[PDB]
Amino acid sequence: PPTEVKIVRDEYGMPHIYADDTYRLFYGYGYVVAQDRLFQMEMARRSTQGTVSEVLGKAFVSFDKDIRQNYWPDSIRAQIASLSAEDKSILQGYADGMNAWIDKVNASPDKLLPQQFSTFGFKPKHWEPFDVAMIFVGTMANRFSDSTSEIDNLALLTALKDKYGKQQGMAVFNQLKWLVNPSAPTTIAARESA
Amino acid sequence: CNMWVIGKNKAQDAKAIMVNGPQFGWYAPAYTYGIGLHGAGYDVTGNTPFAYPGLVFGHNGTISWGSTAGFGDDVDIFAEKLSAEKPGYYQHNGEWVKMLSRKETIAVKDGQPETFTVWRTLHGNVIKTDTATQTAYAKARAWDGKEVASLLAWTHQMKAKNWPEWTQQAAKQALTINWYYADVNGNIGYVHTGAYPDRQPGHDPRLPVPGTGKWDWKGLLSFDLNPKVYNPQSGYIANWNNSPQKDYPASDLFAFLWGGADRVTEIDTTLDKQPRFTADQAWDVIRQTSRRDLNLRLFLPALKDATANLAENDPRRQLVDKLASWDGENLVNDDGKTYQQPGSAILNAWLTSMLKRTVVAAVPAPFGKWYSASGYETTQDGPTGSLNISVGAKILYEALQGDKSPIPQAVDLFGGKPQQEVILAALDDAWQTLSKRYGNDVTGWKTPAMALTFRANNFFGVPQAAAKEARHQAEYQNRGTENDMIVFSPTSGNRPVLAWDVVAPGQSGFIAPDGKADKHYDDQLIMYESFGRKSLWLTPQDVDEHKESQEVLQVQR
Numbered sequence: 001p002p003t004e005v006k007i008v009r010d011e012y013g014m015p016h017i018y019a020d021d022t023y024r025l026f027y028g029y030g031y032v033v034a035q036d037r038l039f040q041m042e043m044a045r046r047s048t049q050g051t052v053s054e055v056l057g058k059a060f061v062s063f064d065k066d067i068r069q070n071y072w073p074d075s076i077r078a079q080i081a082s083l084s085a086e087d088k089s090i091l092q093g094y095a096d097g098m099n100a101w102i103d104k105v106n107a108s109p110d111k112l113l114p115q116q117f118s119t120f121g122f123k124p125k126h127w128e129p130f131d132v133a134m135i136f137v138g139t140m141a142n143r144f145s146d147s148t149s150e151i152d153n154l155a156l157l158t159a160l161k162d163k164y165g166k167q168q169g170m171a172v173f174n175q176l177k178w179l180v181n182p183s184a185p186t187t188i189a190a191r192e193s194a
Numbered sequence: 195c196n197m198w199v200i201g202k203n204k205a206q207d208a209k210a211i212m213v214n215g216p217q218f219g220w221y222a223p224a225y226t227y228g229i230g231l232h233g234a235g236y237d238v239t240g241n242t243p244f245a246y247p248g249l250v251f252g253h254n255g256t257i258s259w260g261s262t263a264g265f266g267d268d269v270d271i272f273a274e275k276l277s278a279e280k281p282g283y284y285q286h287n288g289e290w291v292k293m294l295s296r297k298e299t300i301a302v303k304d305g306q307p308e309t310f311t312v313w314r315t316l317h318g319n320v321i322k323t324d325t326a327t328q329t330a331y332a333k334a335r336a337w338d339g340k341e342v343a344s345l346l347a348w349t350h351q352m353k354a355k356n357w358p359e360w361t362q363q364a365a366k367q368a369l370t371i372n373w374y375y376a377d378v379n380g381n382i383g384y385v386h387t388g389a390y391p392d393r394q395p396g397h398d399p400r401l402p403v404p405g406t407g408k409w410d411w412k413g414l415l416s417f418d419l420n421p422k423v424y425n426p427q428s429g430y431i432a433n434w435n436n437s438p439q440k441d442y443p444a445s446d447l448f449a450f451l452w453g454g455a456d457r458v459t460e461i462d463t464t465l466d467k468q469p470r471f472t473a474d475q476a477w478d479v480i481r482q483t484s485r486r487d488l489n490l491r492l493f494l495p496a497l498k499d500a501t502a503n504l505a506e507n508d509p510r511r512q513l514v515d516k517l518a519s520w521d522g523e524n525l526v527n528d529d530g531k532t533y534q535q536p537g538s539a540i541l542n543a544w545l546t547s548m549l550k551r552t553v554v555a556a557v558p559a560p561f562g563k564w565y566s567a568s569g570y571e572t573t574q575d576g577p578t579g580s581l582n583i584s585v586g587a588k589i590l591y592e593a594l595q596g597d598k599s600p601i602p603q604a605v606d607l608f609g610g611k612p613q614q615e616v617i618l619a620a621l622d623d624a625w626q627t628l629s630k631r632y633g634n635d636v637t638g639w640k641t642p643a644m645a646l647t648f649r650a651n652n653f654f655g656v657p658q659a660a661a662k663e664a665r666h667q668a669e670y671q672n673r674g675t676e677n678d679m680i681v682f683s684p685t686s687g688n689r690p691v692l693a694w695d696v697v698a699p700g701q702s703g704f705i706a707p708d709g710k711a712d713k714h715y716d717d718q719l720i721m722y723e724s725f726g727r728k729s730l731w732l733t734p735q736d737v738d739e740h741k742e743s744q745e746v747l748q749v750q751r
């Protein structure tokens with residue numbers, strides 16, 4: 001049937017998911033994920049949106065600030081709003097798959113709720129597509145792929161110019177932080193392309 | 195992050211092999227999630243960080259893919275001009291333009307809420323403001339607006355079935371990431387993916403630029419310029435976050451350099467020499483690299499030269515002679531706590547002294563300390579990520595090559611003294627510190643071993659598990675957080691593809707309310723350290739053969 005999602009876990013607990021369209025396929029993913037790494041993910045959610053102190057308290061305020069200072073939710077919402085339904089199904093499926101398990105967990109806390117939630121004194125809540133996009137956006141984009149030290153570099157340069165003078169200051173800057181180094185081991189041999 | 199991909203000509207008893215070691219630190223529960231997807235155009239296996247929709251590490255039966263971090267310069271900083279008579283406005287193309295601003299309130303459990311404003315310009319979010327200079331710093335990202343595009347590109351590549359179809363996705367991936375390809379036919383490929391800015395001529399991308407308009411990006415460069423290679427004459431593709439392509443510029447990070455000294459050369463060296471590699475041998479590169487001292491190769495020549503004319507009894511010589519006796523691979527003793535050889539400790543001490551004497555001494559405070567690190571700095575609980583050649587080492591190395599280096603030495607890092615004099619001074623210091631701890635006989639030095647910790651906090655430093663759940667491995671290993679191998683057209687196996695992975699500490703992070711850990715909470719931890727692996731299953735048959743549990747849901751919308 002086009003209404004079914006099958007779930008098969010191998011020897012080491014690894015889920016394989018079997019389904020006939022995009023929404024149900026990722027709904028399955030969401031479901032097995034909420035079983036395996038609920039908590040890891042709830043906390044990844046909060047990390048990636050700077051909503052950590054909401055439950056862990058005063059210690060994580062600067063972190064929350066830092067995160068939210070470092071993106072613009074509305075851009076992410078606009079991007080999602082501007083997807084096809086086919087693409088939008090991936091996210092909405094995932095979020096609902098997760099939400100389905102959480103409903104069961106908030107229906108059998110005494111047998112299903114991961115201990116951490118009891119230990120850290122809060123309960124999991126429902127996921128929306130924005131939340132699931134941000135797991136990726138707030139890690140892969142906003143951590144890795146978000147590297148500058150251009151301000152520090154300028155500080156360094158001005159300190160070098162002060163000692164050494166202007167022309168030599170820059171020459172030393174080039175010696176410490178070259179743009180490009182001809183002798184660098186490259187993953188694509190020079191015979192093939194520059 | 196590392197990877198080696200081995201082509202038809204370089205593979206043995208197979209057509210292609212792809213070995214992938216992404217480095218993101220070590221955590222518990224495991225950083226990546228194991229998942230198989232079957233339906234709606236997808237037939238895939240592997241694993242992926244934070245259970246993203248797209249598998250960053252895996253295969254679909256025909257091809258396989260993977261990633262290492264790119265470190266291209268896809269971020270710049272724009273110096274916005276403001277006026278004291280206009281809060282929230284910046285000058286751009288001769289007119290005063292309004293900043294976007296939102297208000298955020300942070301709810302604090304058992305605490306008073308804090309509210310503040312995020313600002314945003316044309317170029318990006320504001321990262322700092324200097325009222326004194328009337329300037330605001332805005333962070334422009336080439337991938338801005340293409341975040342979810344990139345999420346989706348990761349996913350759709352899983353459907354591709356050849357180089358053309360797959361590169362079409364690669365072009366839609368905007369984050370600065372290295373992408374790797376292998377297939378059943380034994381073709382191998384590489385693409386240094388991402389959006390990268392078309393800069394104005396004269397734009398130095400290591401420093402800020404004015405945001406008043408004339409230095410705005412022209413646009414983005416085309417995918418055509420992104421470095422890429424398909425079936426290279428080398429027979430392999432190897433990467434350890436090193437430069438993708440001759441004359442390609444790296445990230446503007448001061449602490450990051452692609453130069454003469456690069457750890458990828460440790461992989462190159464293993465791979466050259468053996469003309470062909472079976473699967474087992476290709477997976478065994480992990481062990482070899484896991485334990486390789488990265489610095490021995492770079493400095494031992496200078497050390498030998500420097501101590502040749504000393505007496506055989508000079509303790510400085512005893513140190514260098516002992517290093518020369520070493521294969522540069524670290525192993526732990528039976529005590530589970532010290533290294534069989536003392537070579538890393540030696541190099542660390544020497545290099546620390548070496549750097550203070552050269553680079554750091556050439557750089558004004560408080561900046562010199564950016565270059566003071568040897569690369570070995572750790573605690574009981576171990577490094578938190580990969581080991582690498584430090585920035586300072588790399589810069590020193592160029593100085594030791596002298597005329598052999600392409601980088602003009604505007605300052606003589608040796609302060610007009612022979613290199614030899616300094617090298618010895620540093621050896622003296624190392625000998626001084628080490629002998630005081632371990633005594634005067636290098637053969638009786640049991641130096642400390644690096645350990646490994648699976649941390650209960652995620653890389654943000656935010657708890658993702660209880661403190662107790664953190665796990666200790668006796669032996670630190672300069673390897674992937676996970677490892678996976680895909681083998682193509684194995685002449686032995688029936689199936690067209692074989693694939694293995696390892697997801698330590700285990701697939702599940704579930705602990706019941708009564709405290710009972712899942713059966714798959716810890717069951718790959720010992721496998722990890724062992725350099726072991728588990729098989730990855732794709733076909734419905736194989737997945738049925740190794741079932742353990744089965745659930746069926748009726749879903750709709």
Ligand SMILES: [Ca+2]
Nearest residue numbers: 269270399446
């Ligand atoms: Ca830059």
